Amino acid sequence: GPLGTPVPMEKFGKILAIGAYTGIVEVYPIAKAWQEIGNDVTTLHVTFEPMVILKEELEKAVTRHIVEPVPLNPNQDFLANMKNVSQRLKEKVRELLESEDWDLVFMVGPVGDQKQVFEVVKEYGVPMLEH
Amino acid sequence: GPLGTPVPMEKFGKILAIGAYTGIVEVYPIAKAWQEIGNDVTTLHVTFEPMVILKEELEKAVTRHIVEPVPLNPNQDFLANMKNVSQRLKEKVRELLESEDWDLVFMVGPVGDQKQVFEVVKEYGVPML
Amino acid sequence: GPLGTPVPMEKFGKILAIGAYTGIVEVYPIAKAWQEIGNDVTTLHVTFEPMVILKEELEKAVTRHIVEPVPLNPNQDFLANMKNVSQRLKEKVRELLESEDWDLVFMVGPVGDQKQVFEVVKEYGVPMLEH
Amino acid sequence: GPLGTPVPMEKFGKILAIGAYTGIVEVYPIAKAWQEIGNDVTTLHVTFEPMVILKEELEKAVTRHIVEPVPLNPNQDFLANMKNVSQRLKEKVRELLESEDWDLVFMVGPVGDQKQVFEVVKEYGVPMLEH
Amino acid sequence: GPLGTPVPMEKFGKILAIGAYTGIVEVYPIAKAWQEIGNDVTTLHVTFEPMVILKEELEKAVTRHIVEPVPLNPNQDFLANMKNVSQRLKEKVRELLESEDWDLVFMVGPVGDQKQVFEVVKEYGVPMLE
Amino acid sequence: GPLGTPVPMEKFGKILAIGAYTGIVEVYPIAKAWQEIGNDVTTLHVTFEPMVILKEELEKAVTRHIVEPVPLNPNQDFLANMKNVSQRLKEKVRELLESEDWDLVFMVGPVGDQKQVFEVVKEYGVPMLEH
């Protein structure tokens, strides 16, 4: 049967675990285990205002948990709205990589955002892992 | 970099391509290509009312496209709401497998729904991608 | 059981889908789907004169379908004959990459031709997909 | 770049290494190494009369090498001819599994024959591999 | 570069994480994380007396850590000695599966022991991860 | 069921097949088959004095077999002792790559040594394969 994304349990150092939309449900148990193993993981959840979940849970499991709630405008096709989440996603990552330094970046979310986020990462020389 | 789920381009016959939440964006190009290759693909999109997308696009690409919009109750933690989508998902699949017969089922969505949907599928003897 | 080569359904742009010998049977459904998805795929079938297949089918499915029928000389061990197909294969690819520009090259055929064809591709900086 | 099918080097016992068409070129070095490692490998090459290759080489490398040359009828589309090879392939395998007993079956050839051959194998409870 | 065995982080329930010889070094961080995620993992380290490691560390990370130190007889080729570890490995597993019930078994060690241990597991209907 | 590391059977040329601790048991059948296929494989077994195995067997199967027995100091936690094997491992590899030239390096041993050995290999531009 289907299982969570198989990931290696090592000390990579400082990890940026990203979860887009409901993708955060899956990164939760992963980020929790990396922190316990000795990794400084900071999670980022980018989704719509009415969809944040596990906020309380992973602020207590990682060194730092970031939530970027994008407003769900119901006057536009959903595509127009995802475009906003995609934007907020590049901006925050670009901002976190241009800010502090990371040892690894891991993400789980639509393959269209994984691509856009990969572009920002290959930009800074930080290794990545995609679901 | 990251790419769409690599899938085989064959004639499996009748395919049920499922997309949960934004997972439908990815199944779209896949189901479109399977139809053109000679597969009778019917897509199912289970998500919240304010999140259906590509509806028009894949009704024109597949033999049949089904959308099950679950009401987003803003008076409950999001977990309580996903539970409704998970329910609507088992019910519709159970209903489609208990109804017509399929050659293959393929799904893209949270791993928690993929599990629940896999239980319904292993139940009927239909292979899952 | 065994299934067709699992491939990603994206818009890479202009694709050169190659099929050596009976390998064309498998690339057919793949190239057909890539065209429909928005890719400018041109297929190349290199085989012996008495073995071309699906010619009609994939000329209608891709922007352009090329067939290079090599004469099957029955006065030589089959090895000596495959050598001619291997030659015709490097030449046509070298010619198509030195000619137009491609975004991706995908091939299905004996692993000995996949190697020789890979050498020509790494030569032009075009990404590839093997087995 | 592309390499031969990665395979495990163990003693499975009696192995039936199958190579359809030019697929035999690849199974050759594989079957040769399995024999040397202590496996009783018998290879089967199913192809058209004008395409047998490596016959001498692998009769010397395996316990037994079988060649089934199917006549290439030039008065029919190649599809009609492959159908004959597909048939000869099911028949000989069915015949070899219904005859002696095997510990493993490994095959390299078009994915359409790998399927048909897999059906015959799942029939006898013998474990299998592909290309 | 090479990394640890990629594994899924889920609640399978009760997990038997096995580490043969130095294989225990790798299962350590894995079993530690599974316990934290809500799994009742009990680790088993089968090796020679002069090779046990991380004993203290994983008794504190898992519900239960088992160590089976096999005596290293220096009067026999190493092959003859590994045979003893392979034996102690089948026996303890057979004993733990015939005893309590498990939801999953995961192992890291030579491929020759993974096979022998797999035979014992397929015997009881317990799923395995290599 | 679990099987040996699936590996490709080709002529890479000169191969350095490394086996740490009991990892040598698995590389044995692999290195034996590579030699027979036309590869100049030299195996290296790094382990503790009381753990060398297959020495006789693979000196007869490869062009050259190297054994580096590290003394097992029983007055230190096993971790302190593995550190010595890890050291002897980098040194001998560094020494073999700085000495002769290789076409490929393949290793099977703890993932902590595979990493340390990979650093030495990426240093000389020699391609590698892990377990």
mmCIF file of C-alpha atoms in Angstrom, chain E:
data_model
loop_
_atom_site.group_PDB
_atom_site.id
_atom_site.type_symbol
_atom_site.label_atom_id
_atom_site.label_comp_id
_atom_site.label_asym_id
_atom_site.label_seq_id
_atom_site.Cartn_x
_atom_site.Cartn_y
_atom_site.Cartn_z
ATOM 1 C CA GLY E 1 26.473 11.213 -1.937
ATOM 2 C CA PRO E 2 25.280 8.066 -0.062
ATOM 3 C CA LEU E 3 22.660 8.559 2.641
ATOM 4 C CA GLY E 4 20.866 6.464 5.215
ATOM 5 C CA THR E 5 18.161 4.079 4.075
ATOM 6 C CA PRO E 6 15.195 6.305 3.107
ATOM 7 C CA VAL E 7 12.286 5.210 5.266
ATOM 8 C CA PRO E 8 8.642 6.370 5.708
ATOM 9 C CA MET E 9 7.691 8.162 8.918
ATOM 10 C CA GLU E 10 4.341 6.635 9.908
ATOM 11 C CA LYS E 11 2.648 4.915 12.809
ATOM 12 C CA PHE E 12 2.812 1.250 11.922
ATOM 13 C CA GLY E 13 2.290 0.352 15.565
ATOM 14 C CA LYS E 14 4.755 -2.121 17.050
ATOM 15 C CA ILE E 15 8.027 -2.274 15.127
ATOM 16 C CA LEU E 16 10.887 -4.734 15.356
ATOM 17 C CA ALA E 17 13.970 -2.874 14.102
ATOM 18 C CA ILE E 18 16.877 -5.294 13.600
ATOM 19 C CA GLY E 19 20.535 -4.431 13.166
ATOM 20 C CA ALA E 20 23.120 -7.087 12.422
ATOM 21 C CA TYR E 21 26.778 -6.362 13.180
ATOM 22 C CA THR E 22 27.525 -2.670 12.466
ATOM 23 C CA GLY E 23 24.146 -2.435 10.806
ATOM 24 C CA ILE E 24 22.845 -1.251 14.193
ATOM 25 C CA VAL E 25 24.533 2.151 13.719
ATOM 26 C CA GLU E 26 22.192 2.913 10.839
ATOM 27 C CA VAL E 27 19.007 1.519 12.383
ATOM 28 C CA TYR E 28 19.643 3.611 15.483
ATOM 29 C CA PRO E 29 18.585 7.035 14.117
ATOM 30 C CA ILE E 30 15.745 5.269 12.275
ATOM 31 C CA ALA E 31 14.313 3.468 15.328
ATOM 32 C CA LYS E 32 14.731 6.575 17.444
ATOM 33 C CA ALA E 33 12.569 8.586 15.061
ATOM 34 C CA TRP E 34 9.904 5.871 14.793
ATOM 35 C CA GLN E 35 9.498 5.777 18.558
ATOM 36 C CA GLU E 36 9.070 9.570 18.700
ATOM 37 C CA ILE E 37 6.469 9.367 15.917
ATOM 38 C CA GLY E 38 4.333 7.038 18.023
ATOM 39 C CA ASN E 39 5.651 3.562 17.194
ATOM 40 C CA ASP E 40 6.406 0.881 19.780
ATOM 41 C CA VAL E 41 9.773 -0.067 18.369
ATOM 42 C CA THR E 42 11.932 -2.697 19.999
ATOM 43 C CA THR E 43 15.408 -3.025 18.519
ATOM 44 C CA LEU E 44 17.483 -6.155 18.214
ATOM 45 C CA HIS E 45 21.247 -6.096 17.788
ATOM 46 C CA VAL E 46 22.849 -9.420 16.909
ATOM 47 C CA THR E 47 26.657 -9.289 16.700
ATOM 48 C CA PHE E 48 29.825 -10.651 18.308
ATOM 49 C CA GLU E 49 30.561 -9.996 21.986
ATOM 50 C CA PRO E 50 33.372 -7.511 21.194
ATOM 51 C CA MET E 51 31.160 -5.501 18.844
ATOM 52 C CA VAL E 52 28.049 -4.285 20.630
ATOM 53 C CA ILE E 53 27.589 -0.522 20.282
ATOM 54 C CA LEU E 54 24.929 2.115 21.019
ATOM 55 C CA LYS E 55 23.368 -0.194 23.639
ATOM 56 C CA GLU E 56 22.879 2.618 26.177
ATOM 57 C CA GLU E 57 21.689 5.081 23.518
ATOM 58 C CA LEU E 58 18.854 3.030 22.028
ATOM 59 C CA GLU E 59 17.543 1.534 25.266
ATOM 60 C CA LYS E 60 16.673 5.165 26.004
ATOM 61 C CA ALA E 61 15.224 5.760 22.510
ATOM 62 C CA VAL E 62 13.040 2.653 22.036
ATOM 63 C CA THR E 63 10.541 0.868 24.271
ATOM 64 C CA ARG E 64 12.893 -2.130 24.378
ATOM 65 C CA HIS E 65 16.402 -2.848 23.094
ATOM 66 C CA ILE E 66 17.696 -6.422 22.823
ATOM 67 C CA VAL E 67 21.362 -7.385 22.427
ATOM 68 C CA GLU E 68 22.454 -10.935 21.558
ATOM 69 C CA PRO E 69 26.281 -11.111 21.834
ATOM 70 C CA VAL E 70 27.638 -14.181 20.063
ATOM 71 C CA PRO E 71 31.125 -15.344 21.184
ATOM 72 C CA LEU E 72 33.843 -14.702 18.588
ATOM 73 C CA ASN E 73 35.722 -18.023 18.345
ATOM 74 C CA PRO E 74 39.189 -17.091 16.923
ATOM 75 C CA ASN E 75 39.952 -20.756 16.166
ATOM 76 C CA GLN E 76 37.674 -20.851 13.117
ATOM 77 C CA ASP E 77 37.552 -18.996 9.835
ATOM 78 C CA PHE E 78 35.276 -15.994 10.132
ATOM 79 C CA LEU E 79 32.686 -17.776 7.995
ATOM 80 C CA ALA E 80 32.210 -20.460 10.655
ATOM 81 C CA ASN E 81 31.621 -17.667 13.198
ATOM 82 C CA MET E 82 29.100 -15.704 11.146
ATOM 83 C CA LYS E 83 27.141 -18.922 10.899
ATOM 84 C CA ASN E 84 26.612 -18.650 14.667
ATOM 85 C CA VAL E 85 25.342 -15.077 14.393
ATOM 86 C CA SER E 86 23.037 -16.136 11.560
ATOM 87 C CA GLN E 87 21.683 -18.918 13.838
ATOM 88 C CA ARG E 88 21.211 -16.676 16.876
ATOM 89 C CA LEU E 89 19.412 -14.254 14.528
ATOM 90 C CA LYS E 90 16.799 -16.725 13.231
ATOM 91 C CA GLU E 91 16.246 -18.131 16.726
ATOM 92 C CA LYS E 92 15.618 -14.796 18.461
ATOM 93 C CA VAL E 93 13.329 -13.501 15.676
ATOM 94 C CA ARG E 94 11.404 -16.765 15.485
ATOM 95 C CA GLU E 95 11.128 -16.450 19.243
ATOM 96 C CA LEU E 96 9.901 -12.837 19.164
ATOM 97 C CA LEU E 97 7.304 -13.445 16.448
ATOM 98 C CA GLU E 98 6.106 -16.700 18.017
ATOM 99 C CA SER E 99 5.923 -14.747 21.266
ATOM 100 C CA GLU E 100 4.382 -11.276 20.854
ATOM 101 C CA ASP E 101 2.734 -9.834 17.735
ATOM 102 C CA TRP E 102 4.242 -7.186 15.476
ATOM 103 C CA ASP E 103 3.001 -4.746 12.874
ATOM 104 C CA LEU E 104 6.283 -4.401 11.003
ATOM 105 C CA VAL E 105 9.838 -5.693 10.843
ATOM 106 C CA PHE E 106 12.738 -3.689 9.457
ATOM 107 C CA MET E 107 16.291 -4.901 9.096
ATOM 108 C CA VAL E 108 19.746 -3.731 8.067
ATOM 109 C CA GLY E 109 22.605 -6.217 7.811
ATOM 110 C CA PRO E 110 24.352 -8.516 5.301
ATOM 111 C CA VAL E 111 22.060 -9.626 2.475
ATOM 112 C CA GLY E 112 22.603 -13.216 3.553
ATOM 113 C CA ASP E 113 20.981 -12.614 6.936
ATOM 114 C CA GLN E 114 18.270 -10.449 5.453
ATOM 115 C CA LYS E 115 17.228 -13.476 3.433
ATOM 116 C CA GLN E 116 17.282 -15.879 6.409
ATOM 117 C CA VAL E 117 15.387 -13.365 8.525
ATOM 118 C CA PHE E 118 12.863 -12.797 5.701
ATOM 119 C CA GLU E 119 12.026 -16.525 5.676
ATOM 120 C CA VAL E 120 11.105 -16.339 9.380
ATOM 121 C CA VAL E 121 8.985 -13.252 8.802
ATOM 122 C CA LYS E 122 7.046 -14.425 5.733
ATOM 123 C CA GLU E 123 6.301 -17.372 8.014
ATOM 124 C CA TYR E 124 4.166 -15.274 10.394
ATOM 125 C CA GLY E 125 2.459 -12.845 8.024
ATOM 126 C CA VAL E 126 4.365 -9.774 9.272
ATOM 127 C CA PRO E 127 5.273 -7.139 6.622
ATOM 128 C CA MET E 128 8.957 -6.358 6.109
ATOM 129 C CA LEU E 129 11.083 -3.426 4.959
ATOM 130 C CA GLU E 130 14.629 -4.028 3.752
#
